[PDB]
Each structure stands twice: as C-alpha cells, then as structure tokens.
Design a binder for these strands. Structure first.
Ligand SMILES: [Mg+2]
Ligand SMILES: [Mg+2]
Lengths: 72, 58, 95, 189
RNA sequence: AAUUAUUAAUCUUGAACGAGGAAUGCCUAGUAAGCAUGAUUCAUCAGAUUGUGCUGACUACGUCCCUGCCCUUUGUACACA
C-alpha cells in the first residue's frame, strides 16, 4: 500500500500539471492526489501559478494551509 | 424511521440498576409514560419512533 | 430452645395428618404446615388486554381469570420471599 | 452587524427541527466575533446549552493528550475549515455546521434494566441535550482519526466530515455510528 | 585523590520501538492533562521530593450493580474471634 509519488516533472507530465489551475479548490493535498506528484512539487507549481496571476487567493494564507481557487 | 414529537410535563424518578435512566410523563394530545436516557427538564421535547408502547411504573 | 408454642404448625387433638407436595420443589410436607397461597391472576397484562378487546367479536368481552392455589415448603417459600424472618416479639403477630 | 470570524452573519439561520431549537444557541448573547470566551459554563446543570455552538466545536478539537490546552491552535483549525466549506458548495459555513449537528446524533439507544430481576437490553429514548453532545463528539473523532498518518491536513478532513454528515451520506464517521446504535435499539424493543 | 569511566563541551556510530494481551490507577473546575521554574540534599552530581506559576477540555448533577465501611433484625458448637 505504498505511495510512489514522483519527485519532479517529466516532459510529458509538464503540460498536464498546468490544467490544475482550473480547479474549484486548490491545495497541495488535492494537486498531489490527482497527478501523483510530491507535496514539495505541489507547492512549487502553486507558487509559479500564483505569481503570474492565473490563480486567485480565497482568503489570507497561513504557513500551514494554502487554499486557492480559479480566477473568474 | 420517521419521528413524532412529545412534550415533557414532569419527571417522576430514576430507574435502572446504576441510576442512569429517567422516568417521565409526556403529552403529544394523549398522555404516555416513557423512559429516557440523558439529562432532561420539564418542557423538553422527545422524538419518539415507536408510538404505541409504555414503561412500567416505579 | 423451644422457639415456638405450636411447634411450627397448627395441629391439636389429632395423631396424624396426610401430606401434600410442594409446588416448586416437589418435597413432601404435612398439610397443616405448608403455607397456602390462593392467587387470582389475569391471562394477559393491561396493555395486551385492550388489544384483545378491539380484535374481538361480541362488542362486550370479559377475559377469564385463572385460579391456581399453590402450596410450598418452608425452605422453598422463604427463599422466594413469600415469608420473611422476623424479630422475637413480632413472631407472635398473626393476621 | 456582528459576524462570526468577521465574515459570516448567522442572522437568517434556522433549526427547522423544533426539537433541538432550545438546545443549540445562535441568539442574542451567543453572537460573538470570535469563539474565545472565558465563560463558566459547567457550574449549573444546563448552562452548557447557552455556550455558542461553534465554541463547543473548538473545545473538542483539543484531545488525545498531546493537544491539551492548545485553544488558539484549535481556533485556527476550525477557522480555515469554515473557509473550505464556503468555497465548495457555496453557502453559509455556519448553516452547514448547524445541519450536521441536527443529523449526527442517535434518536434512541438501549440500556440494561433489571425491572423483574431479569435484565434485558431494552431500548430507551434520548434527550435533546444528549443528542447535541453526541453529534459534536462523533464529528471530531471522525476527522481526528482520518488525518492521522495521512497527507491531508486536519482542517481539510474536518471540512469533508461536516459536509458528508449534513448530506446523510454513509461516508461519514458520524452517520454510520448513529445507524449502528439505532439498529441495535430497534432490535431490542 | 576521578580507573569500575563525578559532571560538562566538540566530532563520529545510529539498537528496540508503527499505540501495546490477561489485568489495573488517579480524577467533577482555573480541576484533569500538557509546560517550565525556585528551594532541600550540595566540594562536584535530579530522570526524586516539596512549593510556585503559564495554556486550559470532554462528561455527571446520579446510584447501590461491583468493592469497602456503618446501622437494624436474625443464626452460631466462633471469643487467639
Ligand atoms: Mg406421630
Ligand atoms: Mg454494598
């Protein structure tokens, strides 16, 4: 029953991880579950997507919870 | 599976070997005598699932 | 010693009295010493009694009673609390 | 003009049960900005029923020894959980939590009574205050055990537990425990 | 007077232990639990005791079922009971 999360992004996986931007709720646990990636990776993609303003903050973030949502 | 509501009118006493049950009298408008688990007061409301049944006196 | 004037039973002016048998344990006890209880009971309790009324023909029904007339020996009787142990002065209190 | 956490109003929420109305308090003195009041609620028998309903929830997240007394941490966990419940299935987060309380407790149970010397597991009824206590307790333990040794954080598990409980779906710890209690009670009386 | 290494400091090594069977303890409010600290012994050594404060729940508002102690009635061939 071992998880085998990937620890980086492949060329094939590169395009697939970006659709996540179009998600109702956005959190590292949900990103890692849908794409089978690490949690350290899931934080890296959120920081990339947030800086270019493709993802909207739902509320004031904490150091332990980092939920987001789609821009609309 | 469906509930029926009754109004408590007075507590009569406590039953059970360890004293963890409460004896009450309730009205829906017929009167019934029922046996309750948990803290109760006069004016409380109980959701009864079985309608035609009672408890013996104390 | 000699803790009872009548000896635990009511026999006078007689030699022998035939025995009966205990309703609970089958023991033999003379008739003048067993404790007799006559009970008039109901077939069912008051809740199941009114269910029989409204499922009945004749529109006015009286359930019959039962008559038993049980008898017991001393040991099988005071273990079931039909009779208790009393103090010295209260032992003389009849009816 | 008072909101909970400065965001949610509870000025149009109702119980719609008529049995738990007097037992759970969203009203004049229970309207608070934040769930931290240093009240004295365990000095009389029924003063527990005047504590604000959300403060009773935060009082239950500090369990299993390791987290005794950490009240501020529990306030944070619940605050972020109420945000998730709003983001998906967009509604008043407190209204959802009220619905969970009304559906998470058993309506009858069974107890041992030696009425005629013979003891049975004869069934009984549950009082409204007992129902409310059970709902709060069953929801917290379900979230707590779901997050032990898991990727999902404590706040995400709590939000998922509350939504499922109010939806009567048998994927919540509360609903399947409630049905196990009532199944036995039905069998016994 | 430091070997059977008093105590501290630095760099390496990196064992059992994935919440514990039959059983069993202490607790009803600023209490349980968690967190530290003063003092005693003291040339040098607290994983102990005795105090002090900080954060701060759930559950009952009862009962004689289990275990003890007390009261009345009753039986005794026990009185080192
Ligand atoms: Mg003769
Ligand atoms: Mg006793």
């Amino acid at each position: 029953e071992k998880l085998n999360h990937a620890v980086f992004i492949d060329k094939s996986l590169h395009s697939k991880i970006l659709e996540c931007k179009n998600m109702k709720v956005i959190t590292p646990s949900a990103i890692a579950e849908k794409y089978k990636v690490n949690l350290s990776v899931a934080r890296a993609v959120i920081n990339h997507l947030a800086d270019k303003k493709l993802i909207a903050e739902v509320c004031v973030q904490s150091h332990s919870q980092k939920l987001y949502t789609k821009v609309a | 599976e469906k509930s029926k509501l009754a109004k408590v009118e007075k507590v009569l006493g406590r039953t059970g070997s360890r004293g963890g049950v409460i004896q009450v009298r309730a009205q829906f408008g017929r009167f019934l005598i029922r046996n309750v688990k948990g803290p109760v007061r006069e004016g409380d409301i109980l959701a009864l699932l079985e309608t035609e049944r009672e408890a013996r006196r104390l | 010693p000699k803790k009872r004037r009548n000896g635990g039973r009511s026999k006078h002016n007689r030699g022998h009295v035939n025995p009966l048998r205990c309703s609970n344990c089958g023991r033999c006890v003379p008739k003048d010493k067993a404790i007799k209880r006559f009970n008039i009971r109901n077939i069912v309790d008051t809740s199941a009694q009114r269910d029989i009324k409204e499922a009945s023909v004749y529109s006015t029904f009286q359930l019959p009673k039962l008559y038993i007339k049980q008898c017991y020996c001393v040991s099988c009787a005071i273990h079931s609390r039909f009779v208790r142990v009393r103090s010295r002065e209260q032992r003389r209190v009849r009816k | 003009d008072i909101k909970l956490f400065k965001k949610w109003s509870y000025e149009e929420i109702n119980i719609a049960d008529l049995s738990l109305v007097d037992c759970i308090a969203v009203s004049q003195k229970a309207c608070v900005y934040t769930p931290h009041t240093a009240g004295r609620y365990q000095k009389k028998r029924f003063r527990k029923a005047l504590c604000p309903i959300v403060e009773r929830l935060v009082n239950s997240m500090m369990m299993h020894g390791r987290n005794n007394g950490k009240k501020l941490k529990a306030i944070r966990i619940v605050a972020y959980a109420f945000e998730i419940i709003h983001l998906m299935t967009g509604e008043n987060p407190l209204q959802v939590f009220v619905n969970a309380v009304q559906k998470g407790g058993p309506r009858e149970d069974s107890t041992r009574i030696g009425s005629a010397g013979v003891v049975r597991r004869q069934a009984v009824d549950v009082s409204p205050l007992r129902r409310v206590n059970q709902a709060i307790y069953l929801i917290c333990t379900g979230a707590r055990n779901a997050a032990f040794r898991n990727i999902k954080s404590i706040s995400e598990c709590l939000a998922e537990e509350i939504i499922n409980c109010a939806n009567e779906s048998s994927s919540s710890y509360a609903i399947k425990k409630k049905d196990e209690i009532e199944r036995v009670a039905k069998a016994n009386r």
